[PDB]
Design a protein around this nucleic acid. Structure first.
Ligand SMILES: [Zn+2]
Lengths: 37, 49, 49, 239, 119, 51, 186, 99, 251
DNA sequence: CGCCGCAAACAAGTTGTAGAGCTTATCGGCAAGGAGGAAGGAAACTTTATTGCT
DNA sequence: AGCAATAAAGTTTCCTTCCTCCTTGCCGATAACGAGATCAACTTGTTTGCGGCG
């Protein structure tokens, strides 16, 4: 929890890769009825 | 405000001039407005809406 | 019906009645504005009016 | 693009080019509806692609027009993309269009409104049919941050309620009762303390031990009951 | 004295010729460089003044600048530059919610600052 | 159930148990102060006049 | 936001003279007030000369304002905030007293906080020929180029100058500036 | 209206306002500036951590009180990290230097 | 956080439409030129195989054809983000730094001196940050968690949502279309429209009515972007972060 | 160089005050499927209760 | 009191199972109507920067 300072940097793509967990592919969220993902 | 016609003049818009600029406006009850006006150098110009 | 029912229900002007006292109603009914559509706004409009 | 053949590409594409204006004008009344109706560029992309597919498989011995072979796929594509955006089923909307037609038709028949038994009879299926459909169709999406009316006192993001909340003392006394279970059962037969511990403590398996002893769990049942009778020996609210 | 924390440069040899910069830092370098460090490679200076509203943004920290006015522009011109703020103002601590660099928590703050010195 | 002991115990506590009070808007730092309680039978706060 | 005291004294070099704001009419800020809680820039003396009372710095409380108001000084320098040199902060000496407390400010305080509040609070409230001496006293004109006009009186040949009424003692009673080559009776 | 403890937000878990919905009161920057003027660190620290967001904080403090213990432990606001995540969503390597 | 893969690159707006770009500001090129590239309006030289023509040299698509039939091979000129990408990719910093610092000395007239300084420190920044300018682009995106853009139901089964979702979706649809299209090698004009609509969707996600005019729902009201999570009073700072709702309080 | 025009962008605080919709109009048949669905039931399996023996 | 037996009862599992429904994808048949705008905003406003713009 304890940390010293801030730093800003640029978002390299591979950082997007490392931060990610998986690729999304389609528009939907749910069923209209089963209030489910 | 009514429809119809309207007159006015701004006072030193480009305040470097400190000059008056007269202009006229038209406002139908329904439909497009219209604007006639002058420039710093005494020439007429127009714009719709 | 959609147009009718909306601004009888959607307009700013259409308001609950102020049922506290006789005065409240009669005067709130005699109350005048320049706001809503075809009118003005607080922050833009200034002192002149 | 192109093919293996070249003149069958340039004729292809000339035709493709020539009846882009068709794509336009037939689209140019499929307006006011859902906000992509406002866009119109999606429509054009879609139209071109459906055109290519029709083009690919023009059938010439039929002697139909190729415009007439086209219109099919044109429309189908348009409708497809709208169907893409909506996330509700189809026969739903069949029924909806149908009630629309019927109710207007018959409100003209009568000349006044809202006598639902007429809906029941005319759509002689059942009352619960349309009664449910009314839910199913006529209740649509709303958004979250809209202002709360008489300018911006608060939004809809203030006026929200939840049922699945945290509460601090139920888990607290749950753990108290867990140790009270131990407090009861540590004095009792070797397995039953263990089955009920390791099933209730770390959320493991129950008859996993019924397989270990192999006694039929008659005694298990009995001792489970007795432990209940012993923990009806304490006082605690949260009833 | 808060309107005035900048001065433009006369000479050169340390840094760019006329680049706008802290008077205070100019004093530092010349309190370091124009000393027996060297007679002179570093430079002399005009003295600047700045109205408050753009002085305030025009600052080391980006955060306080980023709080209230034109945060995006700040954010860019920092983030391009690999900048980093050092948690010395108040707001810097209240946002993260650490104790203030002053007052009661002054003492633990200087403690943590000698810790910054002491690892 | 609001037993008499309840109020007795409150009296036990709140002696020497100070509080913070606030008018809005806060112009200068005296817009808030730090007072000491005295219980009263109403719904409305009493306050020393001078402030 | 940033501003605090860092250090006890910065040992820093001199600063600004306070001299009174009497202009137009009578005093409008006692020099006493403008001393109250200052720190001297320097050892300072008295009209009977060579009588130091700070070794470069003291708490300038009403004993001293009185001790001075006995006498007739009209100008003193103070280790101003502006001449405080402390890197990232200031000294208390340059500031001096906390008014609301009534003594030397300890180290550790924020300042411009107080400044901003103190200045913003009232401000709401706050939108809402010839020259003729009245009384006797010596006349003092400084940085003048001038000439006896042909009539025999004085007329200014450098816009610099401005008239004063100095009292018979030597402190100023009044000050009114006089145009270039303006007609004087004295 | 008064309020000790009750409902919260959900997106950011901090309390609400309104007697109708058992509302907590607001504490503005003006009130901060004053507090700064006096210079009381632990106070504002507390009300920013425990009585606003830090959930671990609120929990364990309540625990300590009923135990008679009038002491403190801090954490970090969630809303901060929310800001971080918005930033990185905007396509940025925002991050922090560990001690 | 999740992520999304793109077919092709796009570029950021705060790096561009804001006051001084830092993108073309680097290049020494105007605004309008680079718009009309990335609005897919006019080609531009990459790299003349013939030095007949010039780098950074704008090509209207019609006079492009003159050069096209005249040489064909011996030039490279394109229109879009890939093009600018390869430009940004190609150029070295060091030499430009030295030459600017050198020829600075010649005529340090005012506005010239300003612009020279301007670029020089841009360069120095790109160096010493450790950054790569290439990364102006955007070929891959993050996703944020649902809890920050949620979708929850109401008493009578109705719903309430976050508009962001909508904007994600359009993007996705377009990209998927583009893949489907690309699998067929289709005539290119369709591709062009496809990608302009792509980038338009992108920045409209970021900040709706800034470059082009804003997208709304049926109400005629905007589909609120990211930026206004952070901005004005409404933003986190001034609403939710500094001034705070509180328990153990009353009035 | 010194206009000129254009474009950006801030605009008190904290309470409360009640409630939200929709211009809409959006194939249509076939198939094949794959999920689900209900049935009533079989069946480990589990659980109770009533008499036997240490 | 501890220990088991027989009988009865309710099961959960659970698994199929065949009815039925339901939803994902495709392709089709007469012929031609028009390049949108569509219902809005009322011009806050002073200061400041930069691109032209001479
Ligand atoms: Zn000092």
């Amino acid at each position: 929890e304890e940390f010293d300072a801030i730093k800003i940097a640029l978002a390299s793509p591979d950082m997007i890769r490392s931060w990610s967990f998986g690729e999304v592919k389609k528009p939907e969220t749910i069923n209209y009825r089963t209030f489910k993902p | 405000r009514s429809p119809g016609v309207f007159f006015d003049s701004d006072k030193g818009k480009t305040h470097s001039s400190g000059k008056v600029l007269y202009n006229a406006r038209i406002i139908p009850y329904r439909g497009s407005w219209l604007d006639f006006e002058f420039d710093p150098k005494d020439n007429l110009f127009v714009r719709i809406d | 019906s959609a147009a009718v029912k909306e601004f009888f229900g959607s307009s700013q002007l259409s308001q609950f009645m102020d049922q506290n006292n006789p005065l409240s109603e009669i005067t709130h009914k005699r109350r005048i504005s320049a706001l809503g559509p075809g009118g003005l706004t607080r922050e833009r409009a200034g002192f002149e009016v | 693009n192109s093919l293996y053949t070249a003149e069958g590409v340039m004729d292809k594409h000339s035709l493709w080019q020539r009846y882009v204006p068709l794509v336009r004008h037939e689209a140019l009344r499929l307006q006011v509806r859902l906000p992509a109706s406002v866009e119109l560029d999606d429509l054009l992309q879609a139209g071109g692609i459906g055109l290519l597919n029709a083009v690919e498989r023009y059938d010439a011995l039929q002697g139909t027009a190729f415009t007439t072979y086209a219109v099919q796929r044109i429309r189908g594509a348009m409708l497809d993309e709208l169907r893409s955006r909506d996330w509700v089923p189809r026969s739903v909307r069949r029924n909806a269009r149908e009630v629309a037609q019927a109710i207007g038709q018959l409100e003209q028949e009568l000349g006044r409104n809202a006598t639902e038994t007429e809906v029941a009879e005319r759509l002689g299926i059942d009352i619960a049919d349309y009664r449910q459909m009314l839910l199913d169709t006529n209740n649509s999406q709303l958004f979250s941050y809209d202002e709360w009316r008489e300018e911006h006192g608060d939004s809809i993001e203030l006026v929200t309620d939840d049922h699945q909340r945290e509460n601090p003392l139920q888990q607290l006394l749950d753990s108290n009762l867990r140790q009270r279970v131990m407090e009861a059962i540590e004095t009792l037969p070797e397995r039953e303390k263990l089955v009920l511990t390791l099933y209730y403590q770390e959320e493991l398996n129950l008859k996993e031990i019924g397989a270990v002893l192999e006694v039929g769990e008659s005694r298990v049942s009995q001792l489970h009951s007795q432990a209940i009778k012993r923990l009806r020996t304490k006082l605690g609210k949260l009833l | 004295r808060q309107m005035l924390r900048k001065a433009t440069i006369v000479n050169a040899g340390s840094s760019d010729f006329l680049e706008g910069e802290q008077v205070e830092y100019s004093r530092v370098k010349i309190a370091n460089r124009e000393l027996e460090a060297n007679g002179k490679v570093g430079a002399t200076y005009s003295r600047d003044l700045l109205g408050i509203t753009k002085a305030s943004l025009a600052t080391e920290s980006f955060i306080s600048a980023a709080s209230f006015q034109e945060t995006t522009r700040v954010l860019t011109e920092a983030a391009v530059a690999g900048k980093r703020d050092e948690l010395r103002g108040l707001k810097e601590n209240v946002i993260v919610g650490r104790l203030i660099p002053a007052g009661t928590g002054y003492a633990y703050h200087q403690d943590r600052m000698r810790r910054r010195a002491a690892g | 159930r609001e037993e008499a002991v309840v109020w007795d115990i409150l009296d036990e506590v709140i002696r020497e148990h100070p509080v913070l009070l606030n008018r809005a808007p806060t112009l200068h730092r005296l817009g808030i102060q730090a007072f000491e309680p005295v219980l009263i039978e109403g719904k409305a706060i009493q306050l020393h006049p001078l402030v | 936001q940033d501003l605090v005291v860092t250090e006890d004294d910065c040992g820093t070099h001199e600063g600004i003279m306070m001299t009174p704001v009497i202009e137009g009419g009578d005093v409008k800020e006692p020099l006493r007030d403008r001393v109250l809680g200052r720190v001297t820039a320097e050892d300072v003396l008295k009209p009977g000369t060579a009588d130091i009372l700070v070794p470069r710095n003291t708490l300038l409380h009403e004993q001293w304002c009185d001790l001075l108001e006995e006498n007739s000084v009209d100008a003193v320098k103070v280790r101003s905030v502006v001449s405080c040199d402390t890197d990232f902060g200031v000294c208390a000496h340059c500031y001096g007293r906390d008014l609301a407390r009534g003594h030397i400010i300890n180290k550790g305080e924020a300042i411009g906080v107080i400044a901003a509040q103190s200045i913003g609070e009232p401000g709401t409230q706050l939108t809402m020929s010839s020259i003729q001496v009245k009384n006797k006293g010596s006349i003092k004109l400084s940085n003048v180029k001038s000439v006896v006009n042909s009539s025999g009186k004085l007329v200014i040949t450098s816009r610099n100058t401005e008239l004063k009424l100095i009292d018979e003692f030597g402190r100023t009673k009044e000050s009114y500036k006089v145009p270039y080559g303006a007609v004087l009776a004295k | 209206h008064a309020r000790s403890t009750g409902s919260y937000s959900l997106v950011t878990q901090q309390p609400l306002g309104g007697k109708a919905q058992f509302g907590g009161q607001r504490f503005g920057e003006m009130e901060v500036w004053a507090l700064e003027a006096y210079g009381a660190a632990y106070t504002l620290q507390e009300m920013l951590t425990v009585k606003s967001d830090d959930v671990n904080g609120r929990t364990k403090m309540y625990k300590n009180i009923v135990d008679g213990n009038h002491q403190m432990e801090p954490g970090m606001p969630e809303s901060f990290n929310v800001l971080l995540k918005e930033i990185r969503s905007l396509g940025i390597n925002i991050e922090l230097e560990d001690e | 956080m999740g992520h999304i893969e793109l077919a092709s690159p796009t570029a950021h707006i705060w790096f561009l439409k804001s006051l001084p770009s830092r993108i073309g500001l680097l290049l020494d090129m105007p605004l309008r030129d680079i718009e009309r590239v990335l609005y897919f309006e006019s080609y531009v030289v990459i790299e003349g195989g013939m030095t007949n023509l010039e780098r950074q040299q704008i090509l209207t698509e019609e006079q492009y054809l003159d050069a096209l039939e005249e040489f064909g091979d011996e030039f490279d000129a394109k229109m879009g983000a890939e093009a600018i990408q390869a430009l940004l990719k190609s150029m070295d910093l060091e030499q430009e730094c030295e030459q600017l610092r050198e020829e600075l000395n010649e005529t340090n007239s005012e506005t010239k001196r300003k612009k020279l300084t301007k670029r020089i420190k841009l360069l120095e920044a790109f160096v010493q940050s450790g950054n790569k300018p290439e990364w102006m682009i955007l070929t891959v995106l993050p996703v944020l968690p649902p809890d920050l853009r949620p979708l929850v139901p109401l008493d009578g089964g109705r719903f309430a949502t976050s508009d962001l979702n909508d904007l994600y979706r359009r993007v996705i649809n377009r990209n998927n279309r583009l893949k489907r299209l690309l699998d067929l090698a289709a005539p290119d004009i369709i591709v062009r429209n496809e990608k302009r609509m792509l980038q338009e969707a992108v920045d409209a996600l970021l900040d709706n009515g800034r470059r082009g005019r804003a997208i709304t729902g049926s109400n005629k009201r905007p589909l609120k972007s990211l930026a206004d999570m952070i901005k004005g009073k409404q933003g986190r700072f001034r609403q939710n972060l500094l001034g705070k709702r509180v328990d153990y309080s009353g009035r």
